[PDB]
Amino acid sequence: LIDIKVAHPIRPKPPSATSIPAILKALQDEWDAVMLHSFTLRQQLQTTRQ
Amino acid sequence: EHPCVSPVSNHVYERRLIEKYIAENGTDPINNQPLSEEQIPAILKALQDEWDAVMLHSFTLRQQLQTTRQELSHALYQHDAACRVIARLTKEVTAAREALATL
Amino acid sequence: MSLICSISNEVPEHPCVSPVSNHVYERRLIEKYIAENGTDPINNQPLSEEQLIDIIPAILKALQDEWDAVMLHSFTLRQQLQTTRQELSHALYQHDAACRVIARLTKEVTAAREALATL
Amino acid sequence: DVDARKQAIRDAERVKEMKRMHKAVQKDLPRPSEVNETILRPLNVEPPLTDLQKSEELIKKEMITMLHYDLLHHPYEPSGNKKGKTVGFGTNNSEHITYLEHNPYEKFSKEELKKAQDVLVQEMEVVKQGMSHGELSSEAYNQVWEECYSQVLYLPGQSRYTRANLAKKDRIESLEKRLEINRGH
Amino acid sequence: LEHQAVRIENLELMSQHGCNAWKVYNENLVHMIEHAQKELQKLRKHIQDLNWQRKN
Amino acid sequence: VHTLVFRSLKRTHDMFVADNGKPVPLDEESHKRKMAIKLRNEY
Structure with missing residues (x-):
């Protein structure tokens, strides 16, 4: 593996909503969205079988 | 366009330009080491940085608090002495007054 | 063995040791510290990063409570810093007052000594 | 022509004023x-x-x-x-x-303050030994002060500061007031 | 209260710098779209070049 | 000896009873340093 050290332009999404309680609230929702997304892949793959 | 990275400067290049430079110089454009011609997460990072800034804040506050508290600590034992001098002087001024009261 | 980072005062995830202080730092914190400060936190001697030798919701509820737990300590450390400053301001105030009362009484002692010398 | 020097003197006395x-x-x-x-x-x-x-x-x-x-x-x-x-x-x-x-x-005057401070330091030396409580380390002082800080609580009806061990319901009532102050801010 | 203190501290930076940073980030999305459209136009051309090979 | 330290706190804290209605404001220097760190994370 060849390392990269380019800096990140990565940006909040948005900052105006965010605070420590609100980050954890938003993170949970994104967590649920990811688990919905990953399980959709399971569903999709299962569907492509048929 | 093309996927290539110098493994010694860890920097991202377009294959036309880096092979041009290596052919002339024999070396890397960003650190001049040799290189051969062939060669949720945003939220979690932010929340880590939220923790990070508070810890640096916490040390700074600890440093500032302890700096003041050291100076304060010396004054406390001296504070009781301060009341004693005025007490002593109130007795001495009384003694001097009574010598003046005599006559 | 277990260690403590000297900035956090908590266990480092990924520790690095300043030879300028012989003591353990959590790399992402100290490099970010060095970015502004350029100096060793322990003693304000100059320091640079290369010198640093390297070495579900219930979970988020637990994380939130521990996040709040830091904030408990955060107000406390701020308030104790204010209180020690408020003590120091008062203690100098009473010391300066103590000097002025003793100056008042030194003036009293001076006048009384002169008045007894008059006799 | 001299007056430029005189202005420097005038500002130097303002430094002395701040020392007072x-x-x-x-x-x-x-x-x-x-x-x-x-x-x-x-x-x-x-x-x-x-x-x-x-x-x-x-x-x-x-x-x-x-x-x-x-x-x-x-x-x-x-x-x-x-x-x-x-x-x-x-x-x-x-x-x-x-x-x-x-x-x-x-x-x-600066002289009277200095004279009083010198007299103080002589007594402070003697009282430090004469009370004989020694010197704590600053670390030990941290423990003592934080003991003092956690003990000490304000009772509004007495209008005085108190240690919670010396001071139950009024101690709770001051926590209510303490929390109320946080609600206000 | 300290959560509000940290919040209000964040808003100070976000007012001045966040306006510029939003503009820079929105540009970066356009740059992703420009690279994607270039690759799409490369790909659509290549598919239609293949179709001309098929048809001939 | 411990009471002497408390006595210092007690004397100080009485004066602030008049002041006490006001907030717990941030130390400017650490706040500015942190904001510098924060902005450096924004860039």
């Missing part, structure tokens, strides 16, 4: 926006005061006049109220001046 001003002003430390006048005890206090206890009342009255002198000359703000909204700076300086008019602050 109190150490808390010189360090620009926090100063209280109003003065707790209730702190003064009558001389009519019925158990006969030791000169030590008399000394506290002398310090208290002097410090209040110094505070009023500071509220006249050097009133305190931490951060400038302006930025959130233009809060009017309506401190009634006249009231503190009025106290000063009744209770004249003696403008002690």
